[PDB]
Each structure stands twice: as C-alpha cells, then as structure tokens.
C-alpha cells in the first residue's frame, strides 16, 4: 500500500518492515537492534526512516551496548553514526524526531557544547528543537560555568616553561 522501493540494480524490494521494528523495541541492549537491521537487510527489507528512529529510541533508552559492559561506550556516537549511515550510505534523510532523540542524550550526558552544535544544525535544516531541551542545555552550561567545570581542569593549568619531552607528557 505504498510506493514500491527498488535497489540500485533496479530489483524489486520488500517494504514489510513492521515485524522487524517490533524486535527493535523489544530489545534490551542497543547492540541487538543493529543486528536486527542486519537480519532485516539480508531479507531484502532495507531499513526506512521509522526503523532507524526506532533504533535511536532503543539506543537512548537502553542502559548499555551489550550485556556485559564495554570500555569506550559513547551513547552519542552510535546515534550520530546511524545518521551517517542514513544520509550518505542509504540516501534516507533524518527528521525532527531523529535529531530529537539525539539531543536528549547530550542533555543526559551533560555535554552542553555538542548540544549547541545540534541546535544550530537543526535550524540550518529547518528543524526546530523543543525548548524543554534547549533550556536544559543552557542549564547544564550555566552550572558548569559557575562551578569551573566549563572546561576540564587539565586544560586550565600552566604549561612547562621549559621545553622537555617528559613535562609535556610524551
């Protein structure tokens, strides 16, 4: 009941995507959701915007990537890698909902600067954020401002007056 989709080789393509999105929402660790994209794509069902946003929801709302913990987890980077897989690779383009999921995480992560990048990028794409998140970004900014946490501390300390391979930390 929709415009039939085609691959780059003009082959007809499946659209019956619902049964896979449910497997994303039923997930508990947000690495299995990507695997659902894989098992979906093998079946000649390529992902659509709704599916990627389901994955960004499951990312934002899940606790950890895998059952065991992992060093180097960044809840933001996975979400912002899906958008590169979306825009460039697959040709699909995100929407206001997608960037909304993205900005919520930077609020939760407390990283107030990357938020402002997202705030500007939205409106450069016509998207408009929810002020509930914009104000929380500014709140985290003001807190980190007054507290001296505006930057990390290791940047706000003097450098070696004398050149020495050890002092600079290399």
């Amino acid at each position: 009941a929709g415009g039939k989709r085609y691959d780059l080789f003009g082959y007809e393509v499946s659209v019956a995507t619902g049964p896979f999105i449910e497997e994303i929402k039923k997930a508990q660790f947000y690495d299995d959701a990507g695997e659902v994209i894989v098992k979906m794509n093998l079946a000649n069902t390529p992902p659509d915007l709704q599916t990627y946003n389901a994955v960004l929801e499951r990312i934002l709302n899940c606790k950890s990537k895998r059952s065991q913990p992992v060093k180097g987890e960044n809840k933001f980077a996975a979400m912002m890698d899906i958008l590169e897989e979306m825009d460039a690779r697959s040709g699909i383009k995100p929407n206001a909902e997608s960037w909304g999921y993205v900005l919520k995480e930077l609020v939760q992560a407390g990283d107030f600067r990357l938020g402002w990048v997202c705030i500007a990028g939205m409106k450069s794409l016509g998207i408009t954020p929810d002020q509930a998140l914009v104000d929380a970004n500014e709140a985290n900014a003001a807190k980190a401002k007054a507290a001296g946490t505006d930057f990390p501390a290791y940047l706000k300390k003097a450098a070696p007056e004398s050149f020495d391979t050890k002092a600079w930390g290399i």
Binding site: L8, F9, G10, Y11
Partner: protein, 487 residues
Amino acid sequence: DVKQVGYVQQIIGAVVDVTFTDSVPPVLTALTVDAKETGTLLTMEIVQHLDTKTARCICMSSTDMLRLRTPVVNTGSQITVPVGEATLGRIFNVMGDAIDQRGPVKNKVRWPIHRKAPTLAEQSGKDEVLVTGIKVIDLILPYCKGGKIGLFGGAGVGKTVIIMELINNVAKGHGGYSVFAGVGERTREGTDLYLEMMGSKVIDLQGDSKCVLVYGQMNEPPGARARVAQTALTMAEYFRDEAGQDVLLFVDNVFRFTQANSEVSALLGRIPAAVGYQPTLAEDLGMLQERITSTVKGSITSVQAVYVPADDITDPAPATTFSHLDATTVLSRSVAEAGIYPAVEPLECASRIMDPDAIDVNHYNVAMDIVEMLTKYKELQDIIAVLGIDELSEEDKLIVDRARKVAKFMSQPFAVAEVFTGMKGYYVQLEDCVSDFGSLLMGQCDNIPEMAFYMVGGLDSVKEKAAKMAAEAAAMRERARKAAEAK
C-alpha cells in the same frame, strides 16, 4: 541419435584428459559434465588431441569435486551462445548463461563461438573519422569508424577511464548497438559500468537497450577468461552480418586473453616460448583480431585495452597487437605523473587515417607540426636540464613555451573523472579542436598564460580560466597591500 559419452583420464589444474572409445569429436567442441556430482554443470572445451582414443580439454568452470572416470557428454557442437535483440540489456557469462537475476533469455537462434575470419573480399576499408570528444585523439589519432583501436598502457594510466568516457560520448550517440567484453577485468568495474549504463539508460530494461555486456573476470579460471572475447563477437557479428547495424566492441582487455592461455600452455605440454608465453600466441591472437573487422554488411568500431607489464613495450603481447590495429593509442606513466590526463604520448602513437586525403589538410598539417614540435621539445629538456633556459635562442624558447602549452592543453577533464578531478568533463568538437591548436601553433595565443590551458577543453574555456587567474592574483596582490596597511 544418441550422444557418445567419454570417461576422464586425469585432471591437472584446469586441464582434463578424456577418453573416447568410438571416435573423438572435433576440436573446440564442448563437453558437459552433469551437475549431479560436482553441484554445477561443468562445461569443458577441447583444445587438442593426443590419440585416436584420447583428447584433452579445458574447463571454463572450476573442476572441483570431480571424480575420475566421470561420464563426459559430447554435445556434438562447440559452445553455442545466444544472439538477438534479447541479448540486450543483460549480463552474460562465457556460456551465454545470464548471471544477472533478470529472468530467462528469449532466443530464436543460438550461434557458435568460433567462426572463420572474413575473407579478403568481404572486408571493406572506408576512411571515415570518429569523433570521440577527446582532444588528443581527435588530432593525432583520429579514430576511424569501423576500425580497430588500442589503448596501450601499463597500470594506472586511464585506459579503462578512456573506455568509460568513450562509452559516455560515442555509445549514446551511436544509433546502432554496443558490446562490452570484460576479460580479466576487475569484478568491481563491472558494477560501476552496469550501474552507469542503467543510470544513463543505455540499458533500459522496461524500454529498449542497446548494450550487451559480457564478463569473464579475474575470479574466473583461464578457460573462461580466454573464451570471452569470442563470446562478445558471437554477439557482435550477429548485429553486423544479420542485422546490418553498426557495432561498438569495447574490450578490457586483450592481454588477459593471452595470459589465460599462457597459464594452460605448460599443462598442455607445449614448449614455452620466450618471456613465459605460449608458442602459439601470435596465431591465437590473429584468429580473434581478424574476426574484428568491418565488412560489406556492417562495421565493428572496436576499442581494445592492453596491459603492458612493467611498462615494457617489448613484451611480445603488445608488440603482436600493433599489427592488428589502426589507431595504436599509447599511454605513459611520465605524462600521468605530471598531472596530465589522458596520459597520451603523441609521439609514441600514430593512426592510419592520419593521411592528407582521408582527412582535412589543416588537420594533418597542424597535427604533424605539433608532433614535430614536441620532438624538439624533448631535445630541449635534454639541454635545459644541463645548461639552462638562458642558453637557447628566443626563437627556441618560443617553441619551448608552445610545446609546454600544447602538452598541458591536450589534457582534458572527463565526466567519468568527476570523482578524481573534481571538475565537470568537457566535450570538444573536432572543428573547434583545430582552430585552437593551430592558433597556439602560430603564436596566436602566446600572451595567454600556461596553466590556463591545464585541464580544460576548447580555447574559449581558456580565456575564462585565465581571466580568473588574473583576478585571483590581483586578490593576493591587493591583500598583500592591505596586510601592509594593517601592519
């Protein structure tokens, strides 16, 4: 009525030896091994005999899980391949089996793969020029319609890219048909070409296409990679003889056909010739090259690519390909590393229809004057490297600059090279390609700088670029002044 069956003697690599009690079939006959045992139809092809009871043979499919003493069926005919309009817009294998998942092929008829060359009476040489849109070719190597072309060059020079551009320019404007034969090509280039022909709607499945694509690639064994060009000619000679149409026959490339049989010649027991090639190379290549020729019925305007390993022209494979062509286009690493594409050496390449009478006289004289100029130009790098530019007459410095401008001007961006160049390609017409060289030949454009000629098309594009470079120079001059004003 019944087809005789033969039992295998031995299997060494791709070569197999088969017994035949009653009598052995003709040479080049095909021989099927049923897929019950090895999972796939293992077709095989006789190359030579050994005995009245025995004959060895090649396999275009990989001989795996193949027992000894397996029954081998005499088809009674060599490799029949389909021909028609239905072959259009489809990828095909050596056997004519369509590898794309588009469905079956409709075939009212199915011609063999090996056929005798056209008799001398059947041939026909008509001096008619082909407009490639490329700027070197249209002057020094004006390609003849119905003739044979060769893009000789090593690795990394643009011969494949030139083929892509020639498809873009010629095949669209070609009201007839076209054929591409991948012979030892990369399997990735097949995707890029198929997706281009589909995006360009040369291949229009719902509509009508005008391009057959045959692919026997690096992944395939030698018996396949050898029997591809003949497959493409089964496709093309139908369009020539029967349909009477004009045909394009792109080949990437003729050298892999050669070494495919070199990889087998040792197994056949033929004593190898010099550099590691088969003794029957020249004959084997001639049996294919002669099939590529116009006739009274039609015209195949073939284009061939050749790999020159180690950039050594003395390799007998290219050297034997010289005789079998009309436009021996040559590419060189030295021009490529200088930033000039297509990396053609105009002195090392020369065509057949570069005559006074076949083409225009202005064309001929301008071309030969440029060749004559670049010769002196080489002789003067040989001096400037040693003495200096100051040790040459002003009249000599003049032709230095002119040859240095012709070398950079004969560069050209291509629409296919948008990825690498980052600039849109330009189509240069033949008439415009003579009033721009000839102008530069008689000092009509010496005031124009040098780099304005680099990587552009006609002469009108130059003055655009030169006007720019004047502006972007004035910017740094006045910005240097304002830098002095500020500090």
